PDB file of C-alpha atoms and ligand atoms in Angstrom:
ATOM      1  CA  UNK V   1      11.134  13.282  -1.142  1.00 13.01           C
ATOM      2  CA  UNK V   2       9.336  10.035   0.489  1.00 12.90           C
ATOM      3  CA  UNK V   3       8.612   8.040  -2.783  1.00 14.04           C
ATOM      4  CA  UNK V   4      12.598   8.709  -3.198  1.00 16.08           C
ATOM      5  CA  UNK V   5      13.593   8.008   0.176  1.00 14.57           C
ATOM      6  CA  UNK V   6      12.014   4.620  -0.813  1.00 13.59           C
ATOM      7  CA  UNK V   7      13.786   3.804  -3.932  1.00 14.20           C
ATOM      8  CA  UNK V   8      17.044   4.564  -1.222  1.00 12.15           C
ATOM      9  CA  UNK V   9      16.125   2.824   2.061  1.00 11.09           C
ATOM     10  CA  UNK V  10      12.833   0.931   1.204  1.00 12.02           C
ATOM     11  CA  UNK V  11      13.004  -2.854   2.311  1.00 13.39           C
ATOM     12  CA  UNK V  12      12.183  -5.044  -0.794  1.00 15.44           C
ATOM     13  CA  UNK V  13       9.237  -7.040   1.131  1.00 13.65           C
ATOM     14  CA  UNK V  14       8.689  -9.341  -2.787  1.00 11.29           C
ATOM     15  CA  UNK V  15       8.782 -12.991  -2.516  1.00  8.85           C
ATOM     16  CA  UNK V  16      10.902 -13.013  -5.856  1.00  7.01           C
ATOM     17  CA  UNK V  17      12.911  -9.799  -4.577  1.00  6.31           C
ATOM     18  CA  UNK V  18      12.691  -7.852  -7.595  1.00  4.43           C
ATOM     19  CA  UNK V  19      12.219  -4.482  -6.294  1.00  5.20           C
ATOM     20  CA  UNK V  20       8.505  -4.424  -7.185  1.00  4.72           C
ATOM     21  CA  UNK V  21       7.156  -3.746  -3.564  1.00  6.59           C
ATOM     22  CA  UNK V  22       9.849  -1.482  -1.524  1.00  7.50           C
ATOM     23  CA  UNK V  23       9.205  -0.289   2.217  1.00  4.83           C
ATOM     24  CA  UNK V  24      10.066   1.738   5.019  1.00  3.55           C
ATOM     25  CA  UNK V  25       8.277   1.868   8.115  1.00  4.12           C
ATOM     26  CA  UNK V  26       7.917   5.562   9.010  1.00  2.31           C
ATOM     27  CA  UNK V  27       6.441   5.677  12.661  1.00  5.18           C
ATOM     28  CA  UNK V  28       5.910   1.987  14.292  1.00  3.84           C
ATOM     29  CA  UNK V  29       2.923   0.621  15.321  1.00  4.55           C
ATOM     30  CA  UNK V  30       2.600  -2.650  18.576  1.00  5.09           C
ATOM     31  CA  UNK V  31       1.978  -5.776  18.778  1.00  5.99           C
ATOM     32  CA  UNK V  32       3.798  -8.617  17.840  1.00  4.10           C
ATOM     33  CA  UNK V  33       0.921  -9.913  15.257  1.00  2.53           C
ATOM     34  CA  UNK V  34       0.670  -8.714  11.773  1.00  4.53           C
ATOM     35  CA  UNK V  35      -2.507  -9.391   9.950  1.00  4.46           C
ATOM     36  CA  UNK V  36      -2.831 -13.021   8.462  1.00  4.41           C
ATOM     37  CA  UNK V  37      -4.068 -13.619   4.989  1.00  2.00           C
ATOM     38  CA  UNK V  38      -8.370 -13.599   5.361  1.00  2.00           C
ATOM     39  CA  UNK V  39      -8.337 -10.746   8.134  1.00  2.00           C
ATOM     40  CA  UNK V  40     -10.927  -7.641   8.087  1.00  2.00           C
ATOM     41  CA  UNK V  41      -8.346  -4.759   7.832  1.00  2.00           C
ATOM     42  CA  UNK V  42      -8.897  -1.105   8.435  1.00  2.00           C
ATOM     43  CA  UNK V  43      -6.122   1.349   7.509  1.00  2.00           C
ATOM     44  CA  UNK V  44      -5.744   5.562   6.334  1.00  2.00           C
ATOM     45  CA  UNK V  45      -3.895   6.022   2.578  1.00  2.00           C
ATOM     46  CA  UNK V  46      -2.764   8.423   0.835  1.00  2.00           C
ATOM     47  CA  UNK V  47      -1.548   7.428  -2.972  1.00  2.00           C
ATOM     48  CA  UNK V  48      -0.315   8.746  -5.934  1.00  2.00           C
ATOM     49  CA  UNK V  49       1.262   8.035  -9.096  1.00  2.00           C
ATOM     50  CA  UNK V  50       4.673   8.617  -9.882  1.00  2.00           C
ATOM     51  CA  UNK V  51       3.758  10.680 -12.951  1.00  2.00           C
ATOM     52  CA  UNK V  52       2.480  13.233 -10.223  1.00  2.00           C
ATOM     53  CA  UNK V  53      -1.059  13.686 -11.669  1.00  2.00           C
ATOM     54  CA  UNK V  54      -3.402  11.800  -9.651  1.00  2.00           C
ATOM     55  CA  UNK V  55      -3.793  11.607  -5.840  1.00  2.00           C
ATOM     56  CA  UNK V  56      -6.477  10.030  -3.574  1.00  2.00           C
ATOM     57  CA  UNK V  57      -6.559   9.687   0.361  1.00  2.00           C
ATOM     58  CA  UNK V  58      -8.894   7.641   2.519  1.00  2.00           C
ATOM     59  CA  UNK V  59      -9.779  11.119   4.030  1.00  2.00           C
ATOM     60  CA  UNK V  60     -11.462  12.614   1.090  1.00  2.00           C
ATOM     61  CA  UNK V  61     -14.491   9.931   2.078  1.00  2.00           C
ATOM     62  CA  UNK V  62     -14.432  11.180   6.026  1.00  2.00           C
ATOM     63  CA  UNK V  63     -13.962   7.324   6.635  1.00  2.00           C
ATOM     64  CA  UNK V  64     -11.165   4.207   6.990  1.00  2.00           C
ATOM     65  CA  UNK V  65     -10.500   2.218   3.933  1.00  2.00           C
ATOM     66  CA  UNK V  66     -11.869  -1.543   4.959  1.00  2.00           C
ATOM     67  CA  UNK V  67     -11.046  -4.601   3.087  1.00  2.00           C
ATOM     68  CA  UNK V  68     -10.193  -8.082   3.411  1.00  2.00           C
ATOM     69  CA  UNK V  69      -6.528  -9.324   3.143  1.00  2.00           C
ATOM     70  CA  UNK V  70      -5.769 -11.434   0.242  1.00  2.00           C
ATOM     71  CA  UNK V  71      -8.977 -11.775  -1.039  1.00  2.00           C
ATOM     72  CA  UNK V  72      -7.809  -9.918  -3.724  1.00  2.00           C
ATOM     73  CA  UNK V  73     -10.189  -6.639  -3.170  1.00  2.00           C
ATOM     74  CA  UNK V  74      -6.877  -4.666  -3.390  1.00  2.00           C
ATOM     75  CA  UNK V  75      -3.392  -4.806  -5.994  1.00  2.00           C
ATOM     76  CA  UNK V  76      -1.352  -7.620  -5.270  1.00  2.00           C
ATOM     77  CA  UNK V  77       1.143  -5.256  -3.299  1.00  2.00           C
ATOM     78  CA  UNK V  78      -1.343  -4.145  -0.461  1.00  2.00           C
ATOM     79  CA  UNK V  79      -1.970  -7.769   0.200  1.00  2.00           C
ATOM     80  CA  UNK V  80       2.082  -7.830   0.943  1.00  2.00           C
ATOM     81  CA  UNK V  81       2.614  -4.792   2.225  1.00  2.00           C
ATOM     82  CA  UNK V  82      -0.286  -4.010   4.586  1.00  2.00           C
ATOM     83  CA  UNK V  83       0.663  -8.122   5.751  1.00  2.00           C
ATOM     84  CA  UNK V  84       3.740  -6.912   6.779  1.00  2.75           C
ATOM     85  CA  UNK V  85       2.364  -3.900   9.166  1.00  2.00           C
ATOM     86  CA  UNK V  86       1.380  -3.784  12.542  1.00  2.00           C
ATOM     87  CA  UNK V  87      -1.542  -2.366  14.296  1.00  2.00           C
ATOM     88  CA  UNK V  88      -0.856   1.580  14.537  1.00  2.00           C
ATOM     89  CA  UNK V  89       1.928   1.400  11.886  1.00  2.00           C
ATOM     90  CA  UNK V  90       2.564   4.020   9.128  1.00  2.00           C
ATOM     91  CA  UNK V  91       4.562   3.019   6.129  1.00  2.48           C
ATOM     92  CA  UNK V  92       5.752   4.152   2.602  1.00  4.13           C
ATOM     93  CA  UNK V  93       5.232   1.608  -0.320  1.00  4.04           C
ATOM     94  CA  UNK V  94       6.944   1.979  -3.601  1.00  3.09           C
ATOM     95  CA  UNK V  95       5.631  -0.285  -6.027  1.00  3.40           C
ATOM     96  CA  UNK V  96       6.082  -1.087  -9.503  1.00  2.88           C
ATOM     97  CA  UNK V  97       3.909  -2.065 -12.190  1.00  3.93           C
ATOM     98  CA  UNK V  98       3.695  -5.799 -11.792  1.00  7.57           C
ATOM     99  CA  UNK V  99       2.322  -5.514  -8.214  1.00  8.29           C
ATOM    100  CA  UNK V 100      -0.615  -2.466  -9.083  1.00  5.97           C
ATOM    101  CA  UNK V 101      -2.244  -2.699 -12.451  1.00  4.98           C
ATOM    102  CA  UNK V 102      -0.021  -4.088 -14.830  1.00  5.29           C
ATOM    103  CA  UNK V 103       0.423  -2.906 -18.200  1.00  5.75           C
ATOM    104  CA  UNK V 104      -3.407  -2.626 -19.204  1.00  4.29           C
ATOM    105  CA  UNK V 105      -3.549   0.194 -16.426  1.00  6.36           C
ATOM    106  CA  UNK V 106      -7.204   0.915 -15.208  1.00  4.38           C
ATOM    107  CA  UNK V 107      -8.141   3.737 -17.356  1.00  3.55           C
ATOM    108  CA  UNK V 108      -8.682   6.518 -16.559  1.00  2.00           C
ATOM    109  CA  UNK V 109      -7.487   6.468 -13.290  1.00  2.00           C
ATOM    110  CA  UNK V 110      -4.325   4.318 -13.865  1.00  2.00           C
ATOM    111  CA  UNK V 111      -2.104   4.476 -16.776  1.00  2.00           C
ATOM    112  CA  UNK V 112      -0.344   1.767 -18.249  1.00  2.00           C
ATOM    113  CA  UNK V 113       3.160   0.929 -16.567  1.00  2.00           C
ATOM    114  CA  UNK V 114       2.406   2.691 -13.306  1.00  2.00           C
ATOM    115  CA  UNK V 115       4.504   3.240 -10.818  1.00  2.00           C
ATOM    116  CA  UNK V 116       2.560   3.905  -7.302  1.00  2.00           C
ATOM    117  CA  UNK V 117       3.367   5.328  -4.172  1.00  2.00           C
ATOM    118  CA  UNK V 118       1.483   5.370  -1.008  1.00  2.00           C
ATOM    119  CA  UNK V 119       1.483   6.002   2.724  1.00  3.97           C
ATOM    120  CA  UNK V 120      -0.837   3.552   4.852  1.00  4.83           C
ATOM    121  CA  UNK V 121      -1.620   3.816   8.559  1.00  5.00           C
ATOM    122  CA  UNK V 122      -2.957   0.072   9.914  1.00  6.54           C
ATOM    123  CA  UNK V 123      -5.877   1.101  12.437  1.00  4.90           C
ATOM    124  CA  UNK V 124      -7.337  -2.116  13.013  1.00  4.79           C
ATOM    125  CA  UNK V 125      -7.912  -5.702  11.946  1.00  4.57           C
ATOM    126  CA  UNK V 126      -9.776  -8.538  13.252  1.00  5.76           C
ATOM    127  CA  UNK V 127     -10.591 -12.022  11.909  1.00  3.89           C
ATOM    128  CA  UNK V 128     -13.289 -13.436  10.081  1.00  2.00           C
TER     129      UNK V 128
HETATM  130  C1  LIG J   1      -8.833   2.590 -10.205  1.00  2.00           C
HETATM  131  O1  LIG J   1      -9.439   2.233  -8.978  1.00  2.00           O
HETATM  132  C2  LIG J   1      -9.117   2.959  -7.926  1.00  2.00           C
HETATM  133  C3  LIG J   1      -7.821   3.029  -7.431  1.00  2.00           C
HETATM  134  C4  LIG J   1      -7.584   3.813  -6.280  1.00  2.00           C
HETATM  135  C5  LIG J   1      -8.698   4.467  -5.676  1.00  2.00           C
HETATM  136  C6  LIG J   1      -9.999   4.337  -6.204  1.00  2.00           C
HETATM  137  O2  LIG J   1     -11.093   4.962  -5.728  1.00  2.00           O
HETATM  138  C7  LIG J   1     -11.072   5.459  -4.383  1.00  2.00           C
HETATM  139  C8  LIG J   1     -10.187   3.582  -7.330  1.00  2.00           C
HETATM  140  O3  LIG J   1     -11.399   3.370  -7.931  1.00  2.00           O
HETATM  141  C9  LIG J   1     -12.458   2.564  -7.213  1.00  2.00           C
HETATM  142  C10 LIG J   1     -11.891   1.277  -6.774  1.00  2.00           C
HETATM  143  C11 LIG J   1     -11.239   1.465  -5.581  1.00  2.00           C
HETATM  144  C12 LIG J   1     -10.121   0.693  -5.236  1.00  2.00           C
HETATM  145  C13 LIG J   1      -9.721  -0.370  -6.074  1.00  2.00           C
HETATM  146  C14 LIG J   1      -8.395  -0.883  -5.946  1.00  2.00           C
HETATM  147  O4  LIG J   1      -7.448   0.059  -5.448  1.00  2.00           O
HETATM  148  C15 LIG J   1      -6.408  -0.496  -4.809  1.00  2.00           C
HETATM  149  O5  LIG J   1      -6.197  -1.708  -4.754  1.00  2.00           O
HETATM  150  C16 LIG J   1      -5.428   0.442  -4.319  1.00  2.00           C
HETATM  151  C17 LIG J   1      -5.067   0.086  -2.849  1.00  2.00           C
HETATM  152  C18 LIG J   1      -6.300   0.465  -1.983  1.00  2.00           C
HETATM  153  C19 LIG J   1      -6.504   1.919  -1.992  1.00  2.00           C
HETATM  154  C20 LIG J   1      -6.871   2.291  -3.318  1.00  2.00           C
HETATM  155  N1  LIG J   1      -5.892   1.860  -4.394  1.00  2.00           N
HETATM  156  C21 LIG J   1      -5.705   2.585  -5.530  1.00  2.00           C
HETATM  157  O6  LIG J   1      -5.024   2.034  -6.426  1.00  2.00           O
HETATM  158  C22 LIG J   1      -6.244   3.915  -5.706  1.00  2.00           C
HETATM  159  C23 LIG J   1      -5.330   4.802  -6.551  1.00  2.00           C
HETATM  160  C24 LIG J   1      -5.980   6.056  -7.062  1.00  2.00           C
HETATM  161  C25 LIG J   1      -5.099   6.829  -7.941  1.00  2.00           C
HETATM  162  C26 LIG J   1      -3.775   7.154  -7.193  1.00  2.00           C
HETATM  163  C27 LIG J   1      -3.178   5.838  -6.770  1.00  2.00           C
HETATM  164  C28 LIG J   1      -4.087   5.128  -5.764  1.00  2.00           C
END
């Protein structure tokens, strides 16, 4: 299904292009602007790991997931992907290891060697 759909179609979006972040956009947001790096940025998730075992969504806290891009509150591939996304966007990220947590994980949550997959709507995002 959609993490698959990514390995297929997903747009690598890595500086190095080595697969590690892939994309598709699946419904577009407006605006010509994407968020620049120091921007207040609101967005919906859902993620998972590829071993199928662990799943979280913005939802499950009744409230947007807020953070400030690349100020390294989030894995190294949010602060590509989500700088990539315009305001209303949703998109699929595949992303391998060496964008996410590496291989010392984040135990328990995140295993060593993980492979994530999520789907991020962009609400909103202002500047400092
Ligand atoms: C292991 O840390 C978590 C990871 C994720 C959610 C968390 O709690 C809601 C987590 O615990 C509290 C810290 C919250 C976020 C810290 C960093 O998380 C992140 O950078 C990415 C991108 C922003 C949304 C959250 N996220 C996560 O890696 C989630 C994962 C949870 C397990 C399934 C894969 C997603």
């Amino acid at each position: 299904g959609a993490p698959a759909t990514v390995t297929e179609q997903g747009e690598d979006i890595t500086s190095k292009k080595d697969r590690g972040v892939l994309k598709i956009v699946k419904r577009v947001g407006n605006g010509e602007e994407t968020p620049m790096i120091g921007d207040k940025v609101y967005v919906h998730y859902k993620g998972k790991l590829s071993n199928g075992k662990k799943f979280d969504s913005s939802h499950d806290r009744n409230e947007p997931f807020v953070f400030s891009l690349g100020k390294g509150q989030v894995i190294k591939a949010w602060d590509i992907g989500v700088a990539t996304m315009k305001k209303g966007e949703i998109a699929h990220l595949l992303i391998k290891p060496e964008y996410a947590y590496g291989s010392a994980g984040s135990l328990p949550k995140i295993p060593s060697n993980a492979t994530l997959f999520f789907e991020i709507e962009l609400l909103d995002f202002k500047g400092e």
